[PDB]
Amino acid sequence: MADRLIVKGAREHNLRSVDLDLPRDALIVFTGLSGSGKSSLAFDTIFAEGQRRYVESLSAYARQFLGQMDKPDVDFIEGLSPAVSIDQKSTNRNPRSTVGTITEVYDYLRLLYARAGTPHCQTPQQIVDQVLAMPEGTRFLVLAPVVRTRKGEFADLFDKLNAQGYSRVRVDGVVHPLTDPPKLKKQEKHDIEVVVDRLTVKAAAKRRLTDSVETALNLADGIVVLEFVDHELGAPHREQRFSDLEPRSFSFNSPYGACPECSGLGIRKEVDPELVVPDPDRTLAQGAVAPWSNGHTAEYFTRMMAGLGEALGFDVDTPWRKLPAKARKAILEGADEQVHVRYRNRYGRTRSYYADFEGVLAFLQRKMSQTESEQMKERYEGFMRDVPCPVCAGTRLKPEILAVTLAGEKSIAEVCELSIADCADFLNALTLGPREQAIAGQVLKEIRSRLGFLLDVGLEYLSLSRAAATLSGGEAQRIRLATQIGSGLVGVLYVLDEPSIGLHQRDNRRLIETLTRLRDLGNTLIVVEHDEDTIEHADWIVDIGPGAGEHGGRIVHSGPYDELLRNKDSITGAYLSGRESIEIPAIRRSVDPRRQLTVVGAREHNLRGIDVSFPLGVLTSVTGVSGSGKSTLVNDILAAVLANRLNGARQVPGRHTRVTGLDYLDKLVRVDQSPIGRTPRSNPATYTGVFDKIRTLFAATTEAKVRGYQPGRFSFNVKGGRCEACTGDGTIVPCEVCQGARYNRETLEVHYKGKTVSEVLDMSIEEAAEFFEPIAGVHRYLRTLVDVGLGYVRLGQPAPTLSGGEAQRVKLASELQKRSTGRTVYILDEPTTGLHFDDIRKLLNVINGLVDKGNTVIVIEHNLDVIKTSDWIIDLGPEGGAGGGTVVAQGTPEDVAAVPASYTGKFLAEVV
Amino acid sequence: MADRLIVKGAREHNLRSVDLDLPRDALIVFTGLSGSGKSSLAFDTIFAEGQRRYVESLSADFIEGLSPAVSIDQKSTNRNPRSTVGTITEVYDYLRLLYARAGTPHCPQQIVDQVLAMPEGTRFLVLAPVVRTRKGEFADLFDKLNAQGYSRVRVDGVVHPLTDPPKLKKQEKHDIEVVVDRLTVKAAAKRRLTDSVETALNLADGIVVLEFVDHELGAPHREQRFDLEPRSFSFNSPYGACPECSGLGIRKEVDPELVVPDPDRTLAQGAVAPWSNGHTAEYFTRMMAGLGEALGFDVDTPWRKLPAKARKAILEGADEQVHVRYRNRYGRTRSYYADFEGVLAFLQRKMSQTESEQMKERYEGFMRDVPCPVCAGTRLKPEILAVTLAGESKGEHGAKSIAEVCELSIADCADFLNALTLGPREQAIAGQVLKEIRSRLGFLLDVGLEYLSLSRAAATLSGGEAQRIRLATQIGSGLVGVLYVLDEPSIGLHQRDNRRLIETLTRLRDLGNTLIVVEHDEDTIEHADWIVDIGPGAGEHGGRIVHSGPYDELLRNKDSITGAYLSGRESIEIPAIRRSVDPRRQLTVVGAREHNLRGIDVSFPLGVLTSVTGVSGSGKSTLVNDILAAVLANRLNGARQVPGRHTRVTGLDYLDKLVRVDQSPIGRTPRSNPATYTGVFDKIRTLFAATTEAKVRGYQPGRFSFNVKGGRCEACTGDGTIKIEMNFLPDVYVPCEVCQGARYNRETLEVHYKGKTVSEVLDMSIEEAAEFFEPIAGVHRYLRTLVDVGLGYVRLGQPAPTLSGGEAQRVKLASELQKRSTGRTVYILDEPTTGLHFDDIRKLLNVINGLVDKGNTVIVIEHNLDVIKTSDWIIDLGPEGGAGGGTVVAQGTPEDVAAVPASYTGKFLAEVV
DNA sequence: TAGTCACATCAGTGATCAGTGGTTACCACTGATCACT
DNA sequence: TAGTCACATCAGTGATCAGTGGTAACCACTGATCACT
Ligand SMILES: [Zn+2]
Ligand SMILES: [Zn+2]
Ligand SMILES: [Zn+2]
Numbered sequence A: 001m002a003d004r005l006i007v008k009g010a011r012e013h014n015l016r017s018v019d020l021d022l023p024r025d026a027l028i029v030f031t032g033l034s035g036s037g038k039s040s041l042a043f044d045t046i047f048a049e050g051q052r053r054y055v056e057s058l059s060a061y062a063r064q065f066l067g068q069m070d071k072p073d074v075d076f077i078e079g080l081s082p083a084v085s086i087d088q089k090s091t092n093r094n095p096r097s098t099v100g101t102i103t104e105v106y107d108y109l110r111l112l113y114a115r116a117g118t119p120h121c122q123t124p125q126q127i128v129d130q131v132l133a134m135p136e137g138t139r140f141l142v143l144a145p146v147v148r149t150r151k152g153e154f155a156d157l158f159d160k161l162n163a164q165g166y167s168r169v170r171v172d173g174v175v176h177p178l179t180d181p182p183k184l185k186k187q188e189k190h191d192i193e194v195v196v197d198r199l200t201v202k203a204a205a206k207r208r209l210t211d212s213v214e215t216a217l218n219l220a221d222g223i224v225v226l227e228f229v230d231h232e233l234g235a236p237h238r239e240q241r242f243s244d245l246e247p248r249s250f251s252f253n254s255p256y257g258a259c260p261e262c263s264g265l266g267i268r269k270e271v272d273p274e275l276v277v278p279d280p281d282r283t284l285a286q287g288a289v290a291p292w293s294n295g296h297t298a299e300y301f302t303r304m305m306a307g308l309g310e311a312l313g314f315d316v317d318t319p320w321r322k323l324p325a326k327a328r329k330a331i332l333e334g335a336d337e338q339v340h341v342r343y344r345n346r347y348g349r350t351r352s353y354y355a356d357f358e359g360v361l362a363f364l365q366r367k368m369s370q371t372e373s374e375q376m377k378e379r380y381e382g383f384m385r386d387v388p389c390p391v392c393a394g395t396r397l398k399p400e401i402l403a404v405t406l407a408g409e410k411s412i413a414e415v416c417e418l419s420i421a422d423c424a425d426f427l428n429a430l431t432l433g434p435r436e437q438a439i440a441g442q443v444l445k446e447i448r449s450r451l452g453f454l455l456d457v458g459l460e461y462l463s464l465s466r467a468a469a470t471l472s473g474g475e476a477q478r479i480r481l482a483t484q485i486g487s488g489l490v491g492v493l494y495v496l497d498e499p500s501i502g503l504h505q506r507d508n509r510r511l512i513e514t515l516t517r518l519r520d521l522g523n524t525l526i527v528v529e530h531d532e533d534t535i536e537h538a539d540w541i542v543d544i545g546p547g548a549g550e551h552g553g554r555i556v557h558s559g560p561y562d563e564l565l566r567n568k569d570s571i572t573g574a575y576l577s578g579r580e581s582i583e584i585p586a587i588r589r590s591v592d593p594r595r596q597l598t599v600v601g602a603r604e605h606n607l608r609g610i611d612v613s614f615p616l617g618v619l620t621s622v623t624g625v626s627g628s629g630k631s632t633l634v635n636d637i638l639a640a641v642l643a644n645r646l647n648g649a650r651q652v653p654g655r656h657t658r659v660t661g662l663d664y665l666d667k668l669v670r671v672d673q674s675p676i677g678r679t680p681r682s683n684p685a686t687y688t689g690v691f692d693k694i695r696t697l698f699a700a701t702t703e704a705k706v707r708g709y710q711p712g713r714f715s716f717n718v719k720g721g722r723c724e725a726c727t728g729d730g731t732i733v734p735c736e737v738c739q740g741a742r743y744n745r746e747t748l749e750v751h752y753k754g755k756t757v758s759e760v761l762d763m764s765i766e767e768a769a770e771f772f773e774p775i776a777g778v779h780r781y782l783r784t785l786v787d788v789g790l791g792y793v794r795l796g797q798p799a800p801t802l803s804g805g806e807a808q809r810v811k812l813a814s815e816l817q818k819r820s821t822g823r824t825v826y827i828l829d830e831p832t833t834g835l836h837f838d839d840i841r842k843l844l845n846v847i848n849g850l851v852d853k854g855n856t857v858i859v860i861e862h863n864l865d866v867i868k869t870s871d872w873i874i875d876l877g878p879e880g881g882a883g884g885g886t887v888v889a890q891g892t893p894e895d896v897a898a899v900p901a902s903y904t905g906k907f908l909a910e911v912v
Numbered sequence B: 001m002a003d004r005l006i007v008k009g010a011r012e013h014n015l016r017s018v019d020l021d022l023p024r025d026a027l028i029v030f031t032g033l034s035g036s037g038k039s040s041l042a043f044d045t046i047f048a049e050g051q052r053r054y055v056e057s058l059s060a061d062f063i064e065g066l067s068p069a070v071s072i073d074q075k076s077t078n079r080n081p082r083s084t085v086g087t088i089t090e091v092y093d094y095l096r097l098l099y100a101r102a103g104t105p106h107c108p109q110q111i112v113d114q115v116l117a118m119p120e121g122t123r124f125l126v127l128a129p130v131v132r133t134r135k136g137e138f139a140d141l142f143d144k145l146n147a148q149g150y151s152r153v154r155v156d157g158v159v160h161p162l163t164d165p166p167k168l169k170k171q172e173k174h175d176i177e178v179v180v181d182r183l184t185v186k187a188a189a190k191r192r193l194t195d196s197v198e199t200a201l202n203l204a205d206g207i208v209v210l211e212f213v214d215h216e217l218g219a220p221h222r223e224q225r226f227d228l229e230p231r232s233f234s235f236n237s238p239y240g241a242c243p244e245c246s247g248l249g250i251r252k253e254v255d256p257e258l259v260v261p262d263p264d265r266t267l268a269q270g271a272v273a274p275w276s277n278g279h280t281a282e283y284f285t286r287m288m289a290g291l292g293e294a295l296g297f298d299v300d301t302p303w304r305k306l307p308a309k310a311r312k313a314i315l316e317g318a319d320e321q322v323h324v325r326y327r328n329r330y331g332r333t334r335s336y337y338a339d340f341e342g343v344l345a346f347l348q349r350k351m352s353q354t355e356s357e358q359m360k361e362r363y364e365g366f367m368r369d370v371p372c373p374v375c376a377g378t379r380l381k382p383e384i385l386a387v388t389l390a391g392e393s394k395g396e397h398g399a400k401s402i403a404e405v406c407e408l409s410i411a412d413c414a415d416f417l418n419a420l421t422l423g424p425r426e427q428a429i430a431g432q433v434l435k436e437i438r439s440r441l442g443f444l445l446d447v448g449l450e451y452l453s454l455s456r457a458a459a460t461l462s463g464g465e466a467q468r469i470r471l472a473t474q475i476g477s478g479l480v481g482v483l484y485v486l487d488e489p490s491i492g493l494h495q496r497d498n499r500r501l502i503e504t505l506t507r508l509r510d511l512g513n514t515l516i517v518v519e520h521d522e523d524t525i526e527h528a529d530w531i532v533d534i535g536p537g538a539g540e541h542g543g544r545i546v547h548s549g550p551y552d553e554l555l556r557n558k559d560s561i562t563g564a565y566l567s568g569r570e571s572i573e574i575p576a577i578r579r580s581v582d583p584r585r586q587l588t589v590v591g592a593r594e595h596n597l598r599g600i601d602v603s604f605p606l607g608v609l610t611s612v613t614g615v616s617g618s619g620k621s622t623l624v625n626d627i628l629a630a631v632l633a634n635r636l637n638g639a640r641q642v643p644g645r646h647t648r649v650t651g652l653d654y655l656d657k658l659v660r661v662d663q664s665p666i667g668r669t670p671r672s673n674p675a676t677y678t679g680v681f682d683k684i685r686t687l688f689a690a691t692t693e694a695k696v697r698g699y700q701p702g703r704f705s706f707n708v709k710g711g712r713c714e715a716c717t718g719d720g721t722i723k724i725e726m727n728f729l730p731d732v733y734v735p736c737e738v739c740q741g742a743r744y745n746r747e748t749l750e751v752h753y754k755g756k757t758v759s760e761v762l763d764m765s766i767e768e769a770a771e772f773f774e775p776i777a778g779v780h781r782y783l784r785t786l787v788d789v790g791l792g793y794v795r796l797g798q799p800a801p802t803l804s805g806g807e808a809q810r811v812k813l814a815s816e817l818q819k820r821s822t823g824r825t826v827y828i829l830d831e832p833t834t835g836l837h838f839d840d841i842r843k844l845l846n847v848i849n850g851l852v853d854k855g856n857t858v859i860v861i862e863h864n865l866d867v868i869k870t871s872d873w874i875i876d877l878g879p880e881g882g883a884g885g886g887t888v889v890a891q892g893t894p895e896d897v898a899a900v901p902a903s904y905t906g907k908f909l910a911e912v913v
Numbered sequence C: 001t002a003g004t005c006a007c008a009t010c011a012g013t014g015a016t017c018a019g020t021g022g023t024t025a026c027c028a029c030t031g032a033t034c035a036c037t
Numbered sequence D: 001t002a003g004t005c006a007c008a009t010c011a012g013t014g015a016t017c018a019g020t021g022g023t024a025a026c027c028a029c030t031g032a033t034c035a036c037t
């Protein structure tokens, strides 16, 4: 029973000639940095090969014909197993797919509804047990409801029944002989339940009842009825069944049984109201409302909104706590009528937004119903407008079914008006008995399993009624884990992305135990977490990419982890034997009692309303369990407000009250995790805004001037500069004319500085550091890129060849020094995702140097030594989910270390 | 190379807890009786694991060590008119993709490359380009053009400077071809001419010419400009299919002269196929006799000696109407008051009026021909099919139109495609597609299917070529260490048709692939590596493993009854000279000239056990089944199929009835049992209706059947097992709370007929149940035939999928070989060895020998040497495969077929008798 | 040489019913050059 | 501290299309039970 997988000859981008063995019955982690080829091998060489080998076999069958659109490009892999990938799916929208559908509970709940369906208004053992329990000596009748709900005249049926000579019949409860049948009319209602026997419960009678029952068992296909006619215990005429009411068919996504407005799978319940202006303490003149803080529309709406504020009588800048909350209420409801208003924006245009709006609730509705921006007109509706379906309570059913279907089990709210935890604890709380709680089967266990898995991980705060667009990072990283785990199949290979996003270190302290449980089941697991806890648990650790470019396209470590300590070349080994991941004691006194930001009263769904004290001019780090409110406060609340009214962004402030130091702040830059590199059009030089300047500089040459070639003509995406032979991709075997250069001969003649654009792109940035030195902007971009230390990339490198995680690192290098004050706050993502701790320590050297220059960084982190190097740590929430949302420590890393409450400090205290 | 497949927790009905572990480097064969555990073993242990593997991963029991396998079961592919032979050979879509890759439809940079390649110093007037044609008034358009600045124009057929606009009207049509410059050819002037053309490429939408603008205009501008259409690529969609015939294959309905195969028979007897019906024979005889009396042409005279005028007049009929109305044999009268249009136009109305479209296949493809010629056998639009290949040089550099599947064979199409040249583009690399095609093409070539033209379809599909194509297609991948699970793809039919297809398995085994073979053919055995015999018994107690891999262990083993013939333990022989007189009673199919036949005469003796051998799928299966068996069926019982072409049949006065049986697998539905298929259960329920405790309720014996709502327990679906599960898993068979392995309901179980209840009588095998029901002969003969064929321990109440489709299937025929006890009623039998294991082969051979010695007549399609040497007269057809066959090479006794030196089975008899 | 013997089973002969069998996007985000101060 | 006092050159900044990213017959099958003589 060998436990080895073998991969040979893998080649993709910088990765080349990879021959590695993956052991089983143990966890194996690939380490490295974003762009070293580890992500390419983890994602698009092994899983892609397995998927292709699985799908390419068959296409005719219409169950797997939906496959084979995927087109992976891998050489070969032998001795593989069908693997499953676990990573976020960037669909860019999930309105039609609620959280219930992605967790596979919707179809199951529909089957559960269909199982025990009673609208209010089988076996031979079931045939016999009731007559066995029938009291003796009781007069009754045999009933055969064979023409159920088929009202109308049935004299032809009377003649037909007379042909078999049953001699008995019963209509609407009245009994008659077949020889003397009652009159029937087509217009009148006539439900036929023909009496087969006017019998009675006496001794040795069971054969006549058996005959009179099996007659309709073979005629009506297994349905009869018994009817007490002398005792009727239980009803005025007690009867027993041996099987606005419209049964028809059951459907959820069909127009026959769906709401005419919500159109199925759409619920406008959203996350929370009041979210447009939930701040009672901000400076209102600093754009409390998101449309009031746009790049150019900010003043465009502030003009008449300040006019209406002056008219009504509430101040333009005073916080809503010195004023009553009536100010917030009256900016929500506003007032009718319009006033004269017109102003110019920063962009130079002049728009006349002349309309009547009833507060921000109807002002935003007017924006949805009036604006030409088809994106924002639905972007702004979701976060802060709650208008669910009134005719169906937001649910996926016709008006006149939802009441009846639950009357016997009244109206339907369920998945569209409930929460995940409430539904989880309510579904199994109904011990109905005979129908669903009779046999073990799978119903109760399958209901319990996934919901309990969500409970132990911590997804109890989620709600199905909540819009799927409000999915937090923790929810995104945990729901996929739970859904992958629910199968629990033994021997299947799992490959996972970086899990530090959405989870804490203490959360990893249980994710690792979950992974070891999965291993104890008998499967194979692969993670790229890079945390030191996942390391040291691998029998054969492998590290790749000593250099992310051609200088380091070789295997750097593959062994039993014993040689990691002695080998400092490997980055993960260089972290442990650091000489660089030390406390590095800073001044830690650059904080100021007054020159400091505060946030209070943030009563978000992930928070409680605590006061976070952000210092200025420091490397302050916000930490805590993910999903406990740190991201909703630092990013959704703080970064949003200083972005929208300190640089000109558009994000909604969210549920909070106050941010201070408005006079002490000038600019803010936010860099997200942002895995965005997938399209060949996007390049490390095109979106950065440097390629257009490169074209301008190249057109500043004499030859480009004489040949009449402009910067726009000198791009590779517009039809002017791209030859039709390449079709724009450069290599198709490359273009015959271009000969592997991606430039037509009519444009390649521009040899500025002895080189062309293709020559500059081909040349590495490390050797191009001497280039672009005089000209300022490209010099700054290239110099900060080199300061990052990853100058292996080319300017026009396609995004499919860029590993996820490093897409925004290049911009983030230049996104850390503005106005040279340099206290301008920069919100940082986690460098742990992608880059390993040696790359993060080089980044830390950059951060420390420019913080000594005067810069300010607010960073959400996951590791230990990187934030131990910092000077201030703020922990928000010790426990995950609802057990957090409050600050538990704020100060020097050693100060929080001494406090045995914050696990961040506890981690900083066990290693000093 | 050593991927250990482990089977644990495997059991299904007859199968019971079979566990094993094996490496993965050789071929695995399942032997034993048909089904009896091996069919379920090849189903619920590997395919079930693959199912529970892929059905979780598709998104939008526990078995480990196996590889993703492919299914080549019977249902996966059968005869369908929608799919031609191209799709099933996966070369239709394949070759279509390669054609669409870099095809040339035949009839910026190249604009200046033409001048660059043109030797310097020439002279030609490159003055005026062509812009897109516009018509109407363009005063403001020309004003805007002047604002831009061009200084040139050419409208209304006259050239002007742009400053001079001529007269334009909205009612006047102009071919607007404005000028852009006044340049001319010069040395090293490209930088000029480019600036004249390239910018125009952004305004004229890629239109520019170098016209003469001179006086003589001898040539039309040297045809210089800078039928072809892109269209769309699709085969099933109507985007690029035959718009009239909906993209279906051409309905080749040859021959029109199939109306009268045998001319010597009188036309009144029903020589015309619709004229020999059970009820419509006289319905058509009335008009043809009326026409014979009216026109005066003779009828009872054979067609060959008849005048051609009579034949044509009865073929196309005549005009006008006559008063004819008669009754049939079954008591209904048909008042046919219309015109007798021969048998040409009546058929068209017949298939036009009918609703069922399956009974018209025989009456359409073999009566008269009405195909659509717009596509002429092409599943492509008329333009593209020629356009794509008009630039594709093929074979000896011929580029006219795509024929391939439509109009060529394997050999010529492959040879022509091996010389494809679309320019130097595709010569720079060969690619893996070349070897992907070449491996399976060469494997098909060495098999011996060069004659197999691409025009083949379901209309000309045989079982042997079906095995050929399925095996070639599943080998075409040519992987290493990948499981291929296949049930019996078709009947085993010849030793020369096979034993050449198996060489591909031996070649592919060197790679390291592995396959599961559920095949009863003797040729597949003795040339493999690992063989296991499953199912010494066939009932629910029949799930057992006996035989081990190596054939040496087969020699050692005795329970695996393949050794009964492998080591020659027993065999059956010719039943002496029997009742075979030479000259008198010997039917002769003379002048059989069908599609593959060649006007040959074959003598089948009467009152004998005769067999047919030779190159199979080459006109001998049609010889025994298509022409002969159809004739006996339609002129001896009342069948409704055309026979084909044969000049005369003799000796039919010495036959009374015919029974014909195909391969006919029992099925794959658990609701079907051998009781309900053979016909035992009908009279079983009839007898159950006569029981003292079962004749008190009015209802018919239909209550005593497990297929109707009456005696049916609603928890089991008539199976003894709650097989209810969602699509994510096929569940494991479990007993019912009512049955516990009885597949019945207790209420019916009160019928203890002679102390035996229904569940009990369906729970004991026919071996023990033979003692019961002895006094009544109706069930006694059936149980005797079951126990004689070799189905004694068979469970009567057992699902069809896990039972015998080779021996228990043919009991419905063998029990009726006592047809009116004469018993020379003629029988036509398929290849029985499929499903038939060797012990059951011997038992059935003894039964058939006894019945034929009773005085029967049996013609069987057979290939095994032992069974044909058991029969007394072997007819061998086919000097070669396909068109090379169709003629007798040796017909007579086995000694005679071994005597004439033209029969492949004759030299097969030479090495072993 | 012809009107006498009981309310029987054949064996399919050989269309129809009925299990199955498979089959088919409005937005919206980032992309992005030249739209602006 | 007086009206101009010489000379372009970075930054991420909206709106939106543009052009990479996600797609029931057929009735062909055969078996079951069966209508008929
Ligand atoms: Zn609705
Ligand atoms: Zn090119
Ligand atoms: Zn056609």
Ligand SMILES: [Zn+2]
Binding pocket: B713, B715, B716, B720, B721, B736, B737, B738, B739, B740, B743, B744
């Ligand atoms: Zn049961």
